[PDB]
Amino acid sequence: YTAVQKRGSVGRSIDVNRYRGYDELRHDLARMFGIEGQLEDWKLVYVANAILLVGDDPWEEFVNCVQSIKILSSAEV
């Protein structure tokens, strides 16, 4: 299972394989942190220890590589 953290919010743990792909994951995470509809452009990043943007890799490699997920503000990057 995989930590997701967002500053000022209590963190959550998800099992990424419960998703078909990135579109399901963005929605579900947006809802969970009471920011519905604000993750289509706030950055959704994950960590391999380099920090990368979620969505570039193939899904299948992503689920096998991801250790942590964060939701970063424009200000935290």
Side-chain angles (χ1 to χ4, degrees):
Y1 277 80
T2 291
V4 178
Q5 290 180 64
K6 169 186 174 312
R7 189 195 261 174
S9 306
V10 174
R12 306 289 241 94
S13 295
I14 63 179
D15 170 29
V16 283
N17 298 295
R18 288 209 123 211
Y19 305 89
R20 181 177 65 83
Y22 286 109
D23 266 353
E24 258 190 332
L25 195 66
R26 280 196 207 89
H27 271 67
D28 196 37
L29 290 182
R31 238 201 312 114
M32 272 184 187
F33 294 80
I35 64 163
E36 304 84 353
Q38 303 180 47
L39 297 169
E40 321 322 299
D41 319 30
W42 276 153
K43 308 276 162 290
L44 187 60
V45 307
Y46 64 108
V47 218
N49 197 16
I51 287 172
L52 307 172
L53 172 73
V54 166
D56 287 347
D57 315 282
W59 184 248
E60 311 276 294
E61 297 182 14
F62 177 69
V63 305
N64 294 317
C65 273
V66 58
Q67 292 185 329
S68 187
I69 296 175
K70 297 196 184 68
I71 299 172
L72 291 190
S73 77
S74 324
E76 301 175 73
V77 272

